[PDB]
Amino acid sequence: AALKDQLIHNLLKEEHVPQNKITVVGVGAVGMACAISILMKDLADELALVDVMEDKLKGEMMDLQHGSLFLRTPKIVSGKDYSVTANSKLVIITAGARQQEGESRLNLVQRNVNIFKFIIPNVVKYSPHCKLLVVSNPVDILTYVAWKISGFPKNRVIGSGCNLDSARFRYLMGERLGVHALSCHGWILGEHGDSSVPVWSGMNVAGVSLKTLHPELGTDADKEQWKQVHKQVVDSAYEVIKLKGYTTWAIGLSVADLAESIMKNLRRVHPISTMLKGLYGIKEDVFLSVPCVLGQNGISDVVKVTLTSEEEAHLKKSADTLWGIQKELQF
Amino acid sequence: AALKDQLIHNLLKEEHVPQNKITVVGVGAVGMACAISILMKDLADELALVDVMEDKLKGEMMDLQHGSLFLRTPKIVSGKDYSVTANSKLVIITAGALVQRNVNIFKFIIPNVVKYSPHCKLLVVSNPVDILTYVAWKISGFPKNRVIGSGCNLDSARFRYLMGERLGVHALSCHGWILGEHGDSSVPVWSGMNVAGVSLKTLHPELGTDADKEQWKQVHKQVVDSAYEVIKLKGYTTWAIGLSVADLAESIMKNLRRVHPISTMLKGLYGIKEDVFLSVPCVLGQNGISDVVKVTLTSEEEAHLKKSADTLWGIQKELQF
Amino acid sequence: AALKDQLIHNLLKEEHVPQNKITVVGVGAVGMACAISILMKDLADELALVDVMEDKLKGEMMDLQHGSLFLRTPKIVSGKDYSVTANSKLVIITAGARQQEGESRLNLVQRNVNIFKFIIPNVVKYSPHCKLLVVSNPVDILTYVAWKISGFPKNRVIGSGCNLDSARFRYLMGERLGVHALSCHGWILGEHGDSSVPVWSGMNVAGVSLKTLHPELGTDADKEQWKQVHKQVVDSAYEVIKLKGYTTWAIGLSVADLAESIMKNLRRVHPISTMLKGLYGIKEDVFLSVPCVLGQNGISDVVKVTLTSEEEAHLKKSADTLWGIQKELQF
Amino acid sequence: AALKDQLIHNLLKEEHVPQNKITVVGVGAVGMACAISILMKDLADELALVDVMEDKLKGEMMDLQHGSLFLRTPKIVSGKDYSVTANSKLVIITAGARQQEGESRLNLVQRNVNIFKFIIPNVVKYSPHCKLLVVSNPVDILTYVAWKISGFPKNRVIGSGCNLDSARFRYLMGERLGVHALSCHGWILGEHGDSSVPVWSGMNVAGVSLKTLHPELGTDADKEQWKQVHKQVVDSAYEVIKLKGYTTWAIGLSVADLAESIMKNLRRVHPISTMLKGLYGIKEDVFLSVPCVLGQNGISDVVKVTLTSEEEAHLKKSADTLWGIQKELQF
Ligand SMILES: O=C(O)c1ccc(-c2ccccc2)nc1
Ligand SMILES: O=C(O)c1ccc(-c2ccccc2)nc1
Ligand SMILES: O=C(O)c1ccc(-c2ccccc2)nc1
Ligand SMILES: O=C(O)c1ccc(-c2ccccc2)nc1
């Protein structure tokens, strides 16, 4: 009698269980950039969104759903209750507090810790086996906080870390050199941000080391000021925030790329933040960006880059800073 | 010599004439959704963004540029000056403010567009879209095949999604057309709704009427209201409109000749005698709209289109260019 | 210290389990067309190939593997031993014998049964939960054979059936109308091949019924002879075989499209062959093509097309003929 | 009134000109692998095939056309007559004479030269401004022949060169190290074939030089025998031919990737053969593979790789042997 039933004969009951589900936590501008980038690359057969702002959340979900004709991701869901995130292979954390003025660093972090104490247990409860990917800043610290709270082995807790900044570096490199970023290679490692380390000895096109051609590369004795590009990279995000208010598109694309490696088990190497106690001369429980092999089991291996003693010292300094801070957090 | 020249021997004096360039005018939430959707579909070898808000504009450009490693569009440019848009195949208009005001705005945007891309196709998304497509058309001087309104494209996609939810199948497999004037006055063509060539109206003759126990009529209402419901929740809409626009971009750039519910100057057809744009099923390719399907309409569906034409013309009569 | 261990520090011990594995059985031209199309649509994270021709098999695997740089499917495996197919979501059967001089078509069918008696139990053993998609001809009969041998519920055994033929029909429709195949709708249903049924009443563009515009559509009294469009469809495989000796590309593309719906749980409606006893007036255990909702559990629902009395008669006759052949096969 | 005219009202009476047309010359297994890969990457709005085997040609065209529903390339054409190739952006030559015996090299080349004397003039007649991409072996010599016959400037005449062999190298590299080929970097340069040059110095993951971790890399004294990996690349085509009779998929994928850089003006660096007189110590009109910037105007720039004296002389010798043969060609 009903039209559906007149039109369609049902032969199979529902067993409905997601096979490649991704959850994004937080629907601010970064969260939604990750979401659209992930939808348009067909990485998931289901997408879930969660946030505390219920109207905003429902709106974003609906807008995405109205695009269904143009996507190959058949199920998009959302809710404040984390049961909608259940059985995710990958859960991306973009939520957090924004540093107020006068706040102080340690105080900003703690407020983010307090948010994660609510988020992380809810993620783990409904997706015990997922990979966690943290994007919230400061990423290296907050990836640690998510690791400790979730109880997950280190291979399953990832920080986007320096992934986008390495992408920005390759872009600026390509602009100076007149070739596409895809063909330009450079690595930024360590602590996300201004303390991050541009590995000059690895920068090359077509296997041709720029440092071998141009020995001054990276020093202050450089007429071409290539050391500036790293600073350009670091500065360029705050430049963008100053211009449009925030950044979204690039980080979203960045995160989708990582998600691809994970969902398809590509085992590509990305500069991302991993718990590297024991490597790179690091002694504390700290996340730093190093070239990681990324696949369906998270970070399985790490490339041991050969660093100068200065570069090694930089990583140690950041490890001390990060640790000193984490030592003062309330969990 | 410079490091670049130690690394790279140049063999050709490079001339950059973009071959598959697309411009988005307006970097609001709609314009930027179009941009990112277009970028992720690999439709252009160059993207230009233009807006009057210079800081916002430069910020959006830089943000997209930073994602270059993950894209296949080698050049992204922007500026308030329209030289940056030069030689575009397709220029998508998302800027706007009424109507005589938009006329005044378009009186600046469109001639700037035509000056730097004399041969481009125009795609207007700005509301009220049927009227502004007419405006952009008159000011442009372009023949009608080259000026296109997003029209009922998204609302059809919304309708098809809601059809899919009700039937338990993907929107791709649910067919249905919303035509005419974009918005509250649009026409849900009940007679064409079908899955796998099976008319819903033939199975269920009450489809779309008040006596319809399933209230399919409310589905069209829900479509007409959905933008409003989404704005109420998040403040605006973006993703779906951007996706629907990139899909039109795709048919154009790849000369697909797919059929879309978009707004075209339909004088001479469907009984209309004025210069107005309404959504009908249009064949869309590298030359824009070259053909339209003649939907068989009920006598009152027809009178509904004629009414929208007189409504649009009534407004269009006033304006001055 | 090995170069690998010098370069890369291992942090995890992988027990590799494929999450979106597809297997193609038979690396003839049809099988390798399915394989390349599936690879270029990023539908799987692992591809396995099996065939009895061991050299040919290894050669195809290696050729595909040499392309890994340009693909996003990290693992391509092969072997005559079906352990390589273990834990496949989807297994595509293109293996078959070709007729000799010589033998009747029935005798040719039985030899394909004997081939399936070997393949199907091996497939089921290593992938108990997979869906089966049978492409080998005659496809309605061989899909039934696979159903029977496998013991799978009907929702999981799918025949490619009239999927390609409908695609061909839509292409020829679009050539006549000056519109892309994506916007021309029309269905070829029933038994794959000569006896297939062009459902004239369903043919439309933008929801405008051609039949209503042109009541002669598909009749002998039709001055535009649209029936010849169906005849072109029925003959197109033969025509391509006369010119190039076989067909590959189109069937491969049409199979990858079915694979997409399955791997991504899209629930798109495809004209494919399904066990339809109990529907469409059919009283026998036969597979015929009807519009099927295709997803991760295979065929969950079928659309009930309104058929004329003469159309129902063609289907029933097809069911009789199919069933008649099936009783004569040795299982 | 015809059904078409009842259904569709024509508003525009317009003409032809394809905007991103690609032509493939030769519908052997290589040309068709190029074609399907190009079709599935959405690189063209029109595809033309040409070959002297008219039935085969028409068969392949039809087979591809039947897959229209599943593609986004609206027009596929073919003909023995080159007018079908008019206004191509890019023309890919995969036609050539085969090997028999008693190779007076300047014979199975001079015969290819006589074949090109027919093809290339026809190509340039209908596409005066196309880029030429030669894949036929021997590729460095045949790219020179097409360059001479066409009258084209060197930037627009390209040979596939060592592009696939580098991809194979990066694949084998990935297998040894446990990471995807996309993250494994290495270049094979110079004369395509046995005499190609593995550039040991440039091989790396994430900017870490393997030669620097492992100085013996590439030498006979290499305990890990990485020299054999290059030899394995040089032999792989022969190994695959031995197994399946030819190679197709890998070369096709590699060629489509060059086509992408051209059609989208990506300016990526690929190891392809380019007329390198004046560079790398060479003074003759020959084509060798070096890292090239590839865009909408073909090869506009070359990367100058730092070579060992041993590597340099190896390239110089290749140049002289190529010229030695080219001298003896009758045009
Ligand atoms: O480096 C950037 O551009 C960058 C990185 C992270 C974020 C970010 C902002 C809010 C919430 C989560 C992440 N924004 C910008
Ligand atoms: O139907 C909608 O949701 C819809 C349509 C157009 C627009 C739109 C808004 C501003 C500028 C251009 C276009 N927004 C929403
Ligand atoms: O309709 C066609 O073109 C068509 C369909 C199936 C097959 C086919 C041939 C051998 C093995 C398996 C399948 N060939 C051609
Ligand atoms: O290296 C290879 O696998 C390889 C390269 C070229 C070709 C090739 C063969 C015939 C015509 C054109 C190109 N085959 C194999």
Side-chain angles (χ1 to χ4, degrees):
Chain A
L3 173 58
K4 175 189 180 187
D5 300 323
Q6 269 214 285
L7 180 70
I8 295 178
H9 185 101
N10 173 252
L11 290 164
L12 196 63
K13 189 247 185 193
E14 61 141 357
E15 359 277 35
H16 278 44
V17 168
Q19 293 305 294
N20 301 87
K21 178 180 183 164
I22 302 183
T23 292
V24 182
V25 167
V27 289
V30 173
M32 289 312 292
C34 294
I36 192 70
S37 290
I38 287 173
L39 288 165
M40 293 205 69
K41 282 163 68 62
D42 300 346
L43 301 182
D45 64 0
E46 174 169 332
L47 183 65
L49 307 178
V50 298
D51 199 306
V52 294
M53 306 183 72
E54 294 183 67
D55 278 12
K56 168 69 160 172
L57 175 63
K58 187 187 177 108
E60 292 297 356
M61 172 187 68
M62 295 184 50
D63 206 356
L64 292 187
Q65 285 175 336
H66 291 169
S68 289
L69 172 62
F70 314 113
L71 301 169
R72 300 292 161 111
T73 297
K75 188 179 226 80
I76 302 170
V77 300
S78 74
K80 197 154 84 298
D81 175 72
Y82 278 81
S83 70
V84 299
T85 71
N87 293 143
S88 294
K89 295 295 198 71
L90 172 67
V91 178
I92 301 163
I93 309 303
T94 63
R98 313 275 119 90
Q99 162 143 21
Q100 298 309 136
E101 188 52 356
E103 166 115 57
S104 114
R105 192 173 188 183
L106 172 66
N107 267 303
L108 170 64
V109 173
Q110 183 58 237
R111 298 185 42 234
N112 283 121
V113 170
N114 292 341
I115 298 180
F116 276 35
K117 285 180 70 170
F118 173 72
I119 289 175
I120 300 311
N122 277 105
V123 179
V124 171
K125 176 196 179 73
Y126 285 106
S127 291
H129 315 120
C130 77
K131 274 67 63 188
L132 282 177
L133 173 56
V134 175
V135 184
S136 321
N137 275 318
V139 60
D140 292 315
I141 296 188
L142 292 185
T143 302
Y144 170 78
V145 173
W147 176 55
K148 182 164 154 70
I149 294 175
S150 67
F152 280 4
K154 59 189 184 171
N155 63 299
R156 289 203 279 134
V157 181
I158 296 116
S160 59
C162 288
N163 185 41
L164 168 58
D165 279 343
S166 291
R168 287 181 165 129
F169 195 70
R170 292 171 75 177
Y171 163 74
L172 287 175
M173 207 176 326
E175 291 296 306
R176 282 193 169 203
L177 290 184
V179 312
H180 194 290
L182 278 163
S183 299
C184 296
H185 313 277
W187 295 73
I188 296 184
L189 309 175
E191 181 188 4
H192 177 54
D194 37 278
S195 294
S196 72
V197 181
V199 184
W200 308 103
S201 64
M203 291 163 55
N204 73 268
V205 172
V208 180
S209 166
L210 297 187
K211 187 68 139 85
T212 299
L213 284 188
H214 188 60
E216 294 299 349
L217 185 81
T219 62
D220 227 58
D222 184 4
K223 289 205 190 188
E224 292 184 51
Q225 285 235 267
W226 275 83
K227 181 173 171 193
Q228 276 311 270
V229 180
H230 169 71
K231 170 177 172 50
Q232 270 201 253
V233 174
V234 178
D235 282 347
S236 70
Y238 121 79
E239 297 289 336
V240 172
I241 292 185
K242 191 156 160 67
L243 287 173
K244 55 177 277 193
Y246 57 90
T247 91
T248 49
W249 306 122
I251 180 68
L253 289 175
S254 136
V255 169
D257 193 50
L258 298 182
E260 186 183 358
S261 283
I262 300 173
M263 300 297 290
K264 296 184 176 301
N265 193 21
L266 295 188
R267 295 181 62 77
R268 288 186 302 189
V269 185
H270 304 264
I272 50 180
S273 184
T274 196
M275 211 295 284
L276 50 48
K277 184 162 98 161
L279 298 173
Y280 284 85
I282 298 315
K283 298 299 193 65
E284 306 292 3
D285 273 9
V286 166
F287 284 71
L288 292 181
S289 279
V290 295
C292 303
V293 181
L294 184 62
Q296 70 186 0
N297 292 142
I299 298 174
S300 68
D301 307 85
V302 171
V303 180
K304 292 125 94 183
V305 177
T306 298
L307 303 161
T308 69
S309 64
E310 294 198 296
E311 295 174 340
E312 288 189 1
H314 287 130
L315 294 187
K316 172 79 190 317
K317 169 187 159 292
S318 295
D320 293 324
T321 301
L322 277 42
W323 182 244
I325 295 179
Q326 298 168 180
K327 187 151 52 72
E328 298 297 326
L329 291 175
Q330 272 187 262
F331 280 92
Chain B
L3 169 55
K4 174 190 173 171
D5 297 343
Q6 295 183 226
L7 178 72
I8 297 179
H9 186 91
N10 173 255
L11 294 161
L12 192 68
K13 202 245 162 215
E14 268 291 339
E15 304 283 319
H16 206 330
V17 40
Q19 292 293 303
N20 294 99
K21 182 174 187 175
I22 294 175
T23 292
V24 176
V25 174
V27 297
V30 180
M32 290 315 301
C34 295
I36 190 64
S37 297
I38 285 168
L39 284 176
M40 299 205 63
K41 284 171 76 56
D42 290 358
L43 301 180
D45 62 352
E46 174 163 320
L47 179 66
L49 305 177
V50 171
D51 199 298
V52 293
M53 305 174 56
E54 289 179 271
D55 278 13
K56 171 73 166 165
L57 174 70
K58 175 176 190 170
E60 290 297 2
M61 176 187 69
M62 286 175 64
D63 199 1
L64 296 171
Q65 282 169 338
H66 289 168
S68 291
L69 179 63
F70 316 109
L71 291 167
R72 251 60 178 187
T73 304
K75 195 176 195 188
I76 293 161
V77 301
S78 74
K80 66 179 187 198
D81 178 79
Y82 277 73
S83 62
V84 297
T85 68
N87 296 138
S88 302
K89 296 299 179 71
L90 167 65
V91 179
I92 296 168
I93 305 292
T94 68
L98 246 68
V99 175
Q100 181 66 53
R101 278 165 68 207
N102 290 126
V103 177
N104 294 331
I105 301 190
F106 279 32
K107 284 247 89 291
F108 180 72
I109 294 173
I110 298 305
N112 270 113
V113 169
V114 172
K115 176 186 187 193
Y116 290 98
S117 297
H119 309 97
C120 74
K121 276 67 75 199
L122 276 174
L123 214 201
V124 181
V125 187
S126 309
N127 284 317
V129 64
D130 296 309
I131 299 179
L132 295 193
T133 300
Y134 167 80
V135 173
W137 176 59
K138 272 309 229 59
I139 299 175
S140 79
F142 286 2
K144 62 188 190 188
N145 59 294
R146 291 214 272 131
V147 186
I148 303 140
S150 54
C152 291
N153 194 46
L154 177 54
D155 285 347
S156 292
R158 292 183 159 127
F159 194 79
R160 294 177 65 178
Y161 163 77
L162 293 176
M163 197 174 334
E165 290 305 279
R166 282 195 178 215
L167 302 185
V169 314
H170 196 286
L172 283 159
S173 298
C174 296
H175 310 275
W177 294 77
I178 295 185
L179 303 183
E181 189 182 354
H182 172 56
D184 291 24
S185 294
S186 63
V187 179
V189 186
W190 306 110
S191 67
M193 289 164 67
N194 75 266
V195 175
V198 181
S199 176
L200 272 48
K201 165 119 291 205
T202 300
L203 291 185
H204 177 73
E206 287 302 302
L207 183 69
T209 67
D210 289 328
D212 181 359
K213 276 118 173 179
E214 299 198 17
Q215 285 295 274
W216 282 84
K217 173 174 257 190
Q218 307 325 126
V219 182
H220 167 69
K221 173 86 179 326
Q222 181 173 4
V223 167
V224 171
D225 288 351
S226 48
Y228 162 83
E229 298 285 10
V230 173
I231 290 156
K232 197 155 81 111
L233 292 174
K234 60 175 273 188
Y236 56 87
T237 80
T238 51
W239 306 118
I241 181 62
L243 286 173
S244 65
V245 169
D247 189 53
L248 301 176
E250 178 177 15
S251 293
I252 291 172
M253 301 299 288
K254 294 178 186 162
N255 189 38
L256 294 187
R257 299 184 65 74
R258 279 187 304 170
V259 184
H260 303 267
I262 45 187
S263 192
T264 195
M265 210 291 276
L266 50 43
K267 181 180 179 186
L269 293 157
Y270 289 84
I272 302 201
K273 299 189 187 199
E274 305 311 324
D275 283 351
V276 301
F277 287 76
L278 287 172
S279 286
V280 293
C282 300
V283 184
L284 182 63
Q286 78 184 357
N287 293 136
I289 296 169
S290 69
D291 302 88
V292 307
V293 176
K294 284 131 77 177
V295 179
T296 296
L297 304 165
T298 69
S299 52
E300 53 180 316
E301 282 175 334
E302 178 149 7
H304 199 107
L305 269 288
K306 216 333 160 197
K307 168 165 310 183
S308 285
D310 293 330
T311 297
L312 294 172
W313 182 243
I315 299 159
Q316 284 166 202
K317 270 159 47 172
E318 308 303 63
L319 319 168
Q320 32 203 150
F321 313 87
Chain C
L3 172 50
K4 172 187 173 172
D5 306 310
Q6 198 158 1
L7 176 65
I8 296 177
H9 186 97
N10 180 256
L11 292 170
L12 228 196
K13 176 177 81 91
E14 232 87 16
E15 55 173 52
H16 186 176
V17 306
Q19 292 302 287
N20 293 89
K21 181 172 177 165
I22 300 171
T23 293
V24 176
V25 174
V27 298
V30 172
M32 291 314 299
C34 295
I36 191 76
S37 297
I38 286 165
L39 285 167
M40 291 194 73
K41 287 165 62 58
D42 300 340
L43 297 183
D45 64 349
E46 180 165 321
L47 177 68
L49 307 176
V50 300
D51 196 286
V52 292
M53 291 175 57
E54 294 191 76
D55 280 4
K56 168 73 166 172
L57 179 67
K58 191 177 167 198
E60 296 290 6
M61 176 194 65
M62 291 177 58
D63 203 354
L64 291 182
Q65 285 175 338
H66 288 155
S68 296
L69 177 57
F70 311 109
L71 302 176
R72 297 296 170 114
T73 297
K75 197 172 186 174
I76 302 175
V77 296
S78 74
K80 165 200 45 176
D81 183 277
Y82 281 71
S83 67
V84 297
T85 70
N87 307 118
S88 293
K89 292 293 204 235
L90 174 65
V91 182
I92 298 161
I93 309 306
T94 72
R98 192 64 262 143
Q99 208 171 0
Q100 287 325 122
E101 326 90 0
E103 66 194 313
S104 66
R105 61 185 53 268
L106 176 68
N107 181 222
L108 176 269
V109 172
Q110 178 63 240
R111 283 170 64 234
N112 283 141
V113 174
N114 298 336
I115 290 183
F116 273 45
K117 279 183 68 151
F118 176 85
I119 290 175
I120 299 310
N122 275 291
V123 168
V124 168
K125 177 181 171 175
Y126 291 98
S127 295
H129 307 110
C130 75
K131 280 79 60 180
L132 294 172
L133 170 55
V134 175
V135 187
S136 313
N137 283 305
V139 70
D140 294 316
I141 288 172
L142 292 186
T143 306
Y144 168 90
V145 166
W147 178 54
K148 199 161 174 283
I149 294 177
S150 63
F152 282 5
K154 62 189 186 212
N155 64 295
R156 292 209 268 126
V157 187
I158 305 157
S160 56
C162 293
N163 186 51
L164 171 58
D165 307 273
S166 289
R168 282 175 168 136
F169 189 63
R170 293 176 66 176
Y171 162 80
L172 296 169
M173 211 187 306
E175 287 302 304
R176 280 205 181 207
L177 295 179
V179 169
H180 195 287
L182 285 159
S183 301
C184 302
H185 306 284
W187 296 73
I188 307 287
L189 301 177
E191 185 182 3
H192 176 59
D194 296 357
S195 297
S196 73
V197 182
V199 184
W200 305 109
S201 70
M203 296 168 61
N204 73 276
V205 175
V208 181
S209 168
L210 276 41
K211 177 71 167 176
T212 302
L213 278 182
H214 181 65
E216 298 278 30
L217 183 80
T219 194
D220 290 327
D222 186 1
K223 318 116 192 302
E224 293 181 47
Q225 301 254 280
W226 277 81
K227 289 184 71 171
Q228 295 304 122
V229 181
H230 174 60
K231 178 182 169 46
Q232 292 181 263
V233 168
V234 168
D235 288 334
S236 48
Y238 178 55
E239 285 303 320
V240 173
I241 287 161
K242 277 190 283 186
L243 299 165
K244 69 175 273 192
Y246 61 89
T247 79
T248 46
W249 303 113
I251 186 55
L253 289 164
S254 67
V255 168
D257 187 50
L258 303 183
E260 172 162 21
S261 286
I262 301 174
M263 301 303 287
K264 293 190 183 299
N265 191 30
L266 298 185
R267 297 177 65 71
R268 282 189 291 163
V269 180
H270 300 268
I272 50 185
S273 183
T274 190
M275 210 294 287
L276 51 52
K277 163 86 150 291
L279 295 178
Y280 282 79
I282 300 310
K283 257 58 191 168
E284 282 310 325
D285 286 0
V286 301
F287 287 63
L288 289 176
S289 289
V290 297
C292 296
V293 182
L294 185 59
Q296 70 184 356
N297 298 137
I299 296 172
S300 63
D301 311 79
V302 311
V303 178
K304 285 178 291 175
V305 180
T306 291
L307 294 184
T308 63
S309 173
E310 95 144 42
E311 290 174 326
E312 291 180 348
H314 279 133
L315 290 189
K316 183 160 179 300
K317 183 169 160 204
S318 276
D320 289 346
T321 299
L322 288 179
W323 179 245
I325 297 173
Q326 274 156 218
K327 283 161 69 206
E328 299 295 335
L329 307 169
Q330 296 181 248
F331 284 91
Chain D
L3 178 57
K4 179 191 170 169
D5 298 328
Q6 283 187 268
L7 177 63
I8 296 181
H9 183 105
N10 177 240
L11 293 171
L12 179 70
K13 296 160 75 275
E14 177 81 43
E15 312 281 343
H16 308 241
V17 59
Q19 298 305 294
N20 296 99
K21 185 171 175 171
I22 294 185
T23 292
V24 173
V25 179
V27 296
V30 178
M32 291 315 298
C34 288
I36 189 73
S37 294
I38 291 172
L39 283 168
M40 290 196 82
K41 282 162 70 54
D42 291 5
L43 300 184
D45 63 354
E46 183 172 313
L47 179 69
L49 310 176
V50 50
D51 195 290
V52 292
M53 305 182 72
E54 292 186 69
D55 282 6
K56 166 78 163 159
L57 178 62
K58 182 176 172 160
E60 296 287 358
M61 175 191 70
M62 284 174 80
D63 203 358
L64 295 179
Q65 283 170 335
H66 291 167
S68 290
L69 177 63
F70 309 113
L71 295 177
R72 299 288 159 116
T73 298
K75 194 172 302 197
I76 298 171
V77 301
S78 75
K80 188 178 50 78
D81 185 88
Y82 281 66
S83 55
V84 307
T85 71
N87 304 118
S88 294
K89 291 307 236 291
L90 164 63
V91 180
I92 301 175
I93 307 305
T94 71
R98 339 84 98 51
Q99 219 40 271
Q100 10 169 153
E101 146 131 29
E103 268 204 39
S104 195
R105 188 163 190 198
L106 21 168
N107 261 165
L108 191 257
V109 174
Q110 170 78 57
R111 280 168 60 214
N112 282 116
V113 177
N114 296 347
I115 293 184
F116 280 34
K117 288 170 85 295
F118 174 70
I119 294 175
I120 301 297
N122 278 286
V123 171
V124 303
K125 172 182 178 184
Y126 294 96
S127 294
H129 312 111
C130 69
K131 274 74 62 180
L132 280 177
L133 179 48
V134 176
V135 182
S136 302
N137 285 318
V139 69
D140 298 311
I141 292 177
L142 292 191
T143 297
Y144 166 83
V145 172
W147 173 60
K148 292 289 284 197
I149 296 171
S150 64
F152 281 8
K154 58 188 185 179
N155 65 285
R156 279 207 268 128
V157 185
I158 301 165
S160 52
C162 295
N163 189 51
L164 176 59
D165 283 358
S166 291
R168 281 170 165 138
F169 188 75
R170 291 174 65 179
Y171 164 76
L172 293 171
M173 227 191 300
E175 289 310 290
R176 281 200 172 215
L177 307 183
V179 307
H180 195 286
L182 286 160
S183 302
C184 295
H185 307 284
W187 297 72
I188 290 167
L189 298 181
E191 188 186 351
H192 174 62
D194 336 74
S195 294
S196 61
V197 177
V199 184
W200 303 112
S201 61
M203 301 178 46
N204 72 272
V205 178
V208 183
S209 170
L210 307 194
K211 167 120 276 194
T212 295
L213 298 184
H214 180 52
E216 307 285 51
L217 181 82
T219 68
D220 295 303
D222 182 355
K223 297 64 151 54
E224 285 188 44
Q225 283 294 263
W226 281 78
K227 165 175 284 303
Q228 292 313 121
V229 176
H230 168 72
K231 173 168 172 52
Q232 187 175 4
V233 172
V234 173
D235 295 349
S236 52
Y238 165 82
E239 292 307 303
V240 180
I241 296 163
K242 183 175 172 69
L243 296 167
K244 60 170 274 188
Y246 57 88
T247 78
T248 39
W249 310 116
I251 180 68
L253 287 165
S254 73
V255 169
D257 186 62
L258 300 176
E260 186 181 0
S261 286
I262 294 173
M263 302 303 286
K264 294 180 174 299
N265 191 42
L266 294 189
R267 295 181 66 77
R268 289 184 300 185
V269 176
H270 306 267
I272 49 195
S273 30
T274 193
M275 211 297 272
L276 51 38
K277 184 193 205 165
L279 292 308
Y280 284 84
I282 299 190
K283 291 165 254 68
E284 303 305 336
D285 285 349
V286 299
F287 290 66
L288 287 176
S289 287
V290 296
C292 296
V293 177
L294 185 59
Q296 63 173 24
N297 304 127
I299 296 165
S300 70
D301 298 277
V302 160
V303 183
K304 295 179 290 182
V305 175
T306 294
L307 297 173
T308 70
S309 53
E310 158 179 328
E311 279 164 345
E312 281 165 358
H314 198 105
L315 241 59
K316 168 98 198 319
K317 165 180 295 196
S318 276
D320 288 330
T321 61
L322 292 181
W323 185 242
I325 306 161
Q326 281 158 213
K327 290 193 313 175
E328 300 284 289
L329 262 30
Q330 262 64 257
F331 288 92

